[PDB]
């Protein structure tokens, strides 16, 4: 408990806020919110605000359903770009049924349920550190995004330099001012691609920070006449954007993944987690990569993962074990992209790891022989398997796997499947200019 009701009232009085954005996240990952004046703040703190819960279902909503808006006090953040006519503050809210029960269709509530299951098994917390990457594009005269990148930088290069501009520096400075724990920031391989790293927090706090980071980055980029995009693969032939997740599991003693007497200084819990993560990777690939553009990133030659394998040092492994040990022991999943919903991805990953721990599965031997060297047939003999190549195949794999369904819940699973099938059907029947360029003149 970081803040209380009285603290929130005092903050609202002293910082002179007149608007509060009670925000939440739908199934598709879009940040939505209900806007209330400061005069209603007390009612908001009484968990008495009603709204339409069907919006959580996204565009596939059918029937209006009334739901409560239980806010979280610890998520109180005051925005700085609010001029002087009253400031704006936000609090991430939980969704509750009218019968005082958390909504099963809320991704945050689902993540809380999965964390409760993990605590039941014996662990304390699930620390996560994300590595989101984003692209910056120049705006047009009509304030519309173009295809021109802001700079032709390189990997870890000092490309933006000093003397103005350097949108990455301004973004990180305002994030630090807003109260974000930023570890580091650097230029990515692709031109105009930047990465900012976070500190390791709890699962829920990390997901909330991810959403707030996306919002703040987009707003600040728009301030400087730029468009910040988190599309997995905005351009062809260039490196994509990833959101590598470094996860660690903790218990009463400390880090559960660390064991000085184990092989690679890894505990049996870490190996069981690896086995669970690798066994069901084909299952949750759809959740971790929920867009059509996502599977355009999962292609060989751009450091994105393409095969289900783990290693400590390899060219684009699905799961990577960083060399750091002790309390910093963690497992990195590299298949996640910034377009994914953080809550759903964390829920499915935690469910897979928990299932692996419960079943005590033995992970396959790590591969370090450049699996890209052989053909598909030459590596299918071993345990190396391909990730789904399209969103439809990933959806089929979701519909087959049961543990991921249990980790998502029936409501979320059904609505996610419906929305993604509509998206796939919409993309399949479209006629793209590629087809015209390839066949209009030839045929």
């Amino acid at each position: 408990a970081k803040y209380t009701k009285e603290d929130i009232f005092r903050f609202a009085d002293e910082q002179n806020v007149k608007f509060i954005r009670l925000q939440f996240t739908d199934i598709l990952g879009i940040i939505k919110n209900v806007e209330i004046p400061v005069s209603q703040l007390k009612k908001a703190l009484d968990n008495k605000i009603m709204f339409d819960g069907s919006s959580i279902e996204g565009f596939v909503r059918i029937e209006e359903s009334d739901m409560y808006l239980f806010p979280d006090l610890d998520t109180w953040v005051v925005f700085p770009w609010t001029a002087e006519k009253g400031k704006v503050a936000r609090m991430i809210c939980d969704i509750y049924n009218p019968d005082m029960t958390p909504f099963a269709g809320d991704p945050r509530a689902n993540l809380k349920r999965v964390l409760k299951e993990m605590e039941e098994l014996g662990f304390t917390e699930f620390n996560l550190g994300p590595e989101p990457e984003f692209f910056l594009f120049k705006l047009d005269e009509n304030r519309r995004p173009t295809l021109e990148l802001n700079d032709s930088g390189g990997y870890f290069d000092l490309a933006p330099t000093d003397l103005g501009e350097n949108c990455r520096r301004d973004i990180v400075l305002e994030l630090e001012e807003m109260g974000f724990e930023i570890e580091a920031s650097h230029h990515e391989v692709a031109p105009g691609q930047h990465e900012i790293d976070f500190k390791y927090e709890d699962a829920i706090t990390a997901c909330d920070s991810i959403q707030t980071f996306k919002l703040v980055v987009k707003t600040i980029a728009r301030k400087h006449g730029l468009h910040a995009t988190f599309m997995p693969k905005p351009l062809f032939g260039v490196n994509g954007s990833g959101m590598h997740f470094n996860m660690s599991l903790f218990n009463e003693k400390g880090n559960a993944f660390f064991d000085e007497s184990g092989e690679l200084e890894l505990s049996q819990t870490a190996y069981h987690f690896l086995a669970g993560m690798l066994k069901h990777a084909r299952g949750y690939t759809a959740v971790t990569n929920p867009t059509i553009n996502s599977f355009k990133r999962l292609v060989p030659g751009y450091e994105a993962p393409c095969y289900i394998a783990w290693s400590g040092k390899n060219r684009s492994p699905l799961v990577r074990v960083p060399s750091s040990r002790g309390l910093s022991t963690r497992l990195e999943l590299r298949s996640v992209d910034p377009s994914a919903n953080p809550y759903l991805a964390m829920a499915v990953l935690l469910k897979a790891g928990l299932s692996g721990i419960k079943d005590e599965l033995t992970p396959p031997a790590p591969v370090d022989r450049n699996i890209y060297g052989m053909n598909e047939e030459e590596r299918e003999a071993t345990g190396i398997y391909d990730l789904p190549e399209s969103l439809g195949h990933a959806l089929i794999e979701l519909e087959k796997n049961e543990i991921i369904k249990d980790g998502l819940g029936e409501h979320i699973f059904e609505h996610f499947i419906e929305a993604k099938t509509i998206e796939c059907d919409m993309f399949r029947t479209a006629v793209h200019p590629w087809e015209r360029e390839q066949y209009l003149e030839i045929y």
């Binding site: 565009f59 596939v60 909503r61 059918i62 509509i422 998206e423 919409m426």
Partner: peptide
């Protein structure tokens, strides 16, 4: 149900 379509 289908604003996307």
């Amino acid at each position: 149900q289908l604003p996307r379509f």
